[PDB]
């Protein structure tokens, strides 16, 4: 009878068209920590992609240490944290041996799936992201060529020792077949297929995932993505983002999505140039991050920073 | 009451275009092997752990592994002062979780007013700070020297102190008349960065760092650990290691214990012919060498020919 919070894809330190989202990401984490006080969850899982790069800025590392500190030290919520494809494993893994004392777990090794973490009588199976090279070389299997082959092979390590009488939840970072895609995700593959099938996770009672930034990328009773904390591309402009709440109520699993409201959103406006700089066009919020696809090709003086006096946080201009 | 005194690791240090991390991992390995022998009460690292404020992934992993063996595997308390070279936020990352295993990281110079006491000995922490940073905390224009800011620092703890107790100061600065090395940076912007030994007269002992010669200062109360390795050909032939401090009912005794490196820095003189025919005395052919030779004629690439027989040659000078 526990309450589990499922988030993923923080992508701290991300830059969109030369603009830093750290001012925004600090705001959305303020709201994340604020509503976690009201929930008082039994555990939080962060299903990968915490940093946008393998070389996070001094300011971005501060942000993670501060947010994770409030959640785990002063709110005293246990945390499970796996790595993603963007993540720098060792930069994320730093100091993990001291963190385990206060129930803060970090996993950057797909080998760790054989070692599940048990919180509130629930078994969490962690499987950080791994490429197929580094997967096929641990198993020494040369017939591992697609992401699914290596992922299924990882689960056959743990399938015989798994406990069927408890609640087994898999935390991973991968692409499920049939999920919608945004342009804030990098491809995991070269010319192979990166998607894993639904039947791979038949053993697990539940699957908490991250990689696809759309929260409703996969509609399923057993498998579900958290989605990104914010809109990280204009493909997701306007769509709601946030976190997911999962409650196991005496063997009855229920999941719901809770939206978060950002400091500003991403919006796309099409129309005439003189309609938008003369403010004869409707905009939901003129402080938004904006992509302008406009008319009148000839642009007297600078086209864009004439628009920046009206709309300060404009990012791209297409014509 | 046995204390280990070390400083100036400068992890990630580059010397003449080569990373010294392979050497530093060997000397840190030998340091904790000698920490298994000497069962110590405290290990003190008086600053300058990294070489820049943005260390590489491998350098960060080395500090985590080394510190981990000391604090966790061997259950040794550690105190970490911030030096003039390393970044304060990268050094204190996760310091809140580390205090539960008695691992103390101080990067704030205003932290001197809250000493750490273990085994009946009080440790006052004075991480490095600049006069522009020290000027703003006290809102004083009196302090334009580095010495006055330190005097200002100790005056905070001067009323709040027990002269009865063993009071040790850990800091990172320059003492008057101390010997210099070329791998050290200037601490101020073109003034006098040195401090007289009278400022530290309220303390029973001063453990310092910044000056890489173990015997920079010859004084009973103020001593320098010195750098882990020779980080410049100015330090060629200098013994390096750590200081051991033993206390028994108020009487302090100090020793210097040297670590023998995998490689040394030698400056070799002679002629190209004798040197390449191995008839000039070289301690170890594997050592890092700077050659001042005199055969300025017949050799195609004199460095490559030299590297054939002396692999770790670093610099060549001809006369
Ligand atoms: Mn992602
Ligand atoms: Mn991803
Ligand atoms: Mn220094
Ligand atoms: Mn130094």
mmCIF file of C-alpha atoms in Angstrom, chain B residues 145-259:
data_model
loop_
_atom_site.group_PDB
_atom_site.id
_atom_site.type_symbol
_atom_site.label_atom_id
_atom_site.label_comp_id
_atom_site.label_asym_id
_atom_site.label_seq_id
_atom_site.Cartn_x
_atom_site.Cartn_y
_atom_site.Cartn_z
ATOM 1 C CA UNK B 145 46.247 42.394 2.021
ATOM 2 C CA UNK B 146 45.908 38.640 2.186
ATOM 3 C CA UNK B 147 47.271 38.698 5.741
ATOM 4 C CA UNK B 148 44.714 41.174 7.099
ATOM 5 C CA UNK B 149 41.841 39.099 5.727
ATOM 6 C CA UNK B 150 43.222 36.046 7.516
ATOM 7 C CA UNK B 151 43.720 38.025 10.727
ATOM 8 C CA UNK B 152 40.123 39.183 10.293
ATOM 9 C CA UNK B 153 39.186 35.511 9.863
ATOM 10 C CA UNK B 154 40.829 34.275 13.065
ATOM 11 C CA UNK B 155 39.386 37.192 15.057
ATOM 12 C CA UNK B 156 35.938 35.616 14.623
ATOM 13 C CA UNK B 157 37.007 32.498 16.556
ATOM 14 C CA UNK B 158 39.328 34.397 18.934
ATOM 15 C CA UNK B 159 36.712 35.021 21.687
ATOM 16 C CA UNK B 160 34.961 31.700 21.021
ATOM 17 C CA UNK B 161 37.901 29.408 21.751
ATOM 18 C CA UNK B 162 39.278 27.236 24.544
ATOM 19 C CA UNK B 163 43.030 27.702 24.917
ATOM 20 C CA UNK B 164 42.855 24.516 27.009
ATOM 21 C CA UNK B 165 42.134 22.378 23.939
ATOM 22 C CA UNK B 166 44.310 21.235 21.046
ATOM 23 C CA UNK B 167 43.389 23.746 18.321
ATOM 24 C CA UNK B 168 44.678 22.948 14.823
ATOM 25 C CA UNK B 169 44.179 25.276 11.858
ATOM 26 C CA UNK B 170 43.811 23.862 8.340
ATOM 27 C CA UNK B 171 44.280 26.457 5.617
ATOM 28 C CA UNK B 172 45.808 27.127 2.200
ATOM 29 C CA UNK B 173 48.077 30.181 1.973
ATOM 30 C CA UNK B 174 51.667 31.423 1.658
ATOM 31 C CA UNK B 175 53.927 31.974 4.674
ATOM 32 C CA UNK B 176 56.709 34.556 4.797
ATOM 33 C CA UNK B 177 60.018 33.161 3.584
ATOM 34 C CA UNK B 178 58.570 29.894 2.303
ATOM 35 C CA UNK B 179 60.224 28.216 -0.649
ATOM 36 C CA UNK B 180 58.463 28.386 -4.007
ATOM 37 C CA UNK B 181 57.966 25.987 -6.903
ATOM 38 C CA UNK B 182 56.934 26.607 -10.494
ATOM 39 C CA UNK B 183 53.771 24.467 -10.278
ATOM 40 C CA UNK B 184 52.213 26.927 -7.800
ATOM 41 C CA UNK B 185 50.029 29.860 -8.807
ATOM 42 C CA UNK B 186 50.165 33.399 -7.411
ATOM 43 C CA UNK B 187 47.473 33.895 -4.784
ATOM 44 C CA UNK B 188 46.874 37.656 -5.137
ATOM 45 C CA UNK B 189 46.693 40.244 -7.914
ATOM 46 C CA UNK B 190 50.207 41.645 -7.680
ATOM 47 C CA UNK B 191 50.548 42.471 -3.973
ATOM 48 C CA UNK B 192 52.245 40.507 -1.160
ATOM 49 C CA UNK B 193 50.501 37.159 -0.700
ATOM 50 C CA UNK B 194 52.595 36.032 2.281
ATOM 51 C CA UNK B 195 51.574 35.932 5.947
ATOM 52 C CA UNK B 196 53.767 36.200 9.038
ATOM 53 C CA UNK B 197 53.857 33.319 11.518
ATOM 54 C CA UNK B 198 52.585 35.602 14.297
ATOM 55 C CA UNK B 199 49.044 35.534 12.899
ATOM 56 C CA UNK B 200 48.756 31.839 13.827
ATOM 57 C CA UNK B 201 49.853 32.215 17.457
ATOM 58 C CA UNK B 202 46.451 31.352 18.989
ATOM 59 C CA UNK B 203 46.768 27.847 17.503
ATOM 60 C CA UNK B 204 48.806 24.904 18.757
ATOM 61 C CA UNK B 205 49.533 23.689 15.203
ATOM 62 C CA UNK B 206 48.869 24.848 11.641
ATOM 63 C CA UNK B 207 48.430 22.308 8.835
ATOM 64 C CA UNK B 208 48.873 24.087 5.523
ATOM 65 C CA UNK B 209 48.893 23.620 1.780
ATOM 66 C CA UNK B 210 49.755 25.571 -1.414
ATOM 67 C CA UNK B 211 53.558 25.358 -1.211
ATOM 68 C CA UNK B 212 54.545 22.092 -2.874
ATOM 69 C CA UNK B 213 57.941 21.656 -1.174
ATOM 70 C CA UNK B 214 57.467 19.559 2.000
ATOM 71 C CA UNK B 215 60.078 21.741 3.733
ATOM 72 C CA UNK B 216 58.969 25.142 2.437
ATOM 73 C CA UNK B 217 58.654 26.358 6.042
ATOM 74 C CA UNK B 218 60.948 25.052 8.783
ATOM 75 C CA UNK B 219 59.028 25.838 11.975
ATOM 76 C CA UNK B 220 57.803 23.777 14.907
ATOM 77 C CA UNK B 221 54.149 24.878 14.793
ATOM 78 C CA UNK B 222 53.490 25.603 11.091
ATOM 79 C CA UNK B 223 54.322 22.818 8.651
ATOM 80 C CA UNK B 224 53.632 22.035 4.992
ATOM 81 C CA UNK B 225 52.638 18.625 3.665
ATOM 82 C CA UNK B 226 53.968 19.320 0.179
ATOM 83 C CA UNK B 227 52.601 18.065 -3.109
ATOM 84 C CA UNK B 228 51.980 14.376 -3.747
ATOM 85 C CA UNK B 229 54.363 14.262 -6.721
ATOM 86 C CA UNK B 230 56.905 16.497 -8.400
ATOM 87 C CA UNK B 231 54.653 18.653 -10.588
ATOM 88 C CA UNK B 232 57.487 20.597 -12.249
ATOM 89 C CA UNK B 233 61.107 20.125 -13.236
ATOM 90 C CA UNK B 234 61.831 22.815 -10.649
ATOM 91 C CA UNK B 235 60.912 20.120 -8.092
ATOM 92 C CA UNK B 236 63.263 17.539 -9.615
ATOM 93 C CA UNK B 237 64.923 15.331 -7.021
ATOM 94 C CA UNK B 238 62.584 16.515 -4.257
ATOM 95 C CA UNK B 239 61.133 13.980 -1.846
ATOM 96 C CA UNK B 240 57.332 14.031 -1.708
ATOM 97 C CA UNK B 241 54.711 12.396 0.483
ATOM 98 C CA UNK B 242 52.737 13.204 3.626
ATOM 99 C CA UNK B 243 53.334 14.376 7.185
ATOM 100 C CA UNK B 244 52.377 12.318 10.239
ATOM 101 C CA UNK B 245 51.268 14.125 13.407
ATOM 102 C CA UNK B 246 51.157 12.234 16.712
ATOM 103 C CA UNK B 247 49.687 13.715 19.901
ATOM 104 C CA UNK B 248 49.783 12.380 23.469
ATOM 105 C CA UNK B 249 48.329 14.592 26.226
ATOM 106 C CA UNK B 250 49.092 17.902 24.575
ATOM 107 C CA UNK B 251 52.598 17.226 23.219
ATOM 108 C CA UNK B 252 52.662 17.317 19.414
ATOM 109 C CA UNK B 253 55.239 15.401 17.366
ATOM 110 C CA UNK B 254 55.648 15.657 13.600
ATOM 111 C CA UNK B 255 57.304 13.435 10.983
ATOM 112 C CA UNK B 256 57.597 13.529 7.206
ATOM 113 C CA UNK B 257 57.039 10.191 5.462
ATOM 114 C CA UNK B 258 57.928 9.996 1.747
ATOM 115 C CA UNK B 259 56.082 8.192 -1.045
#
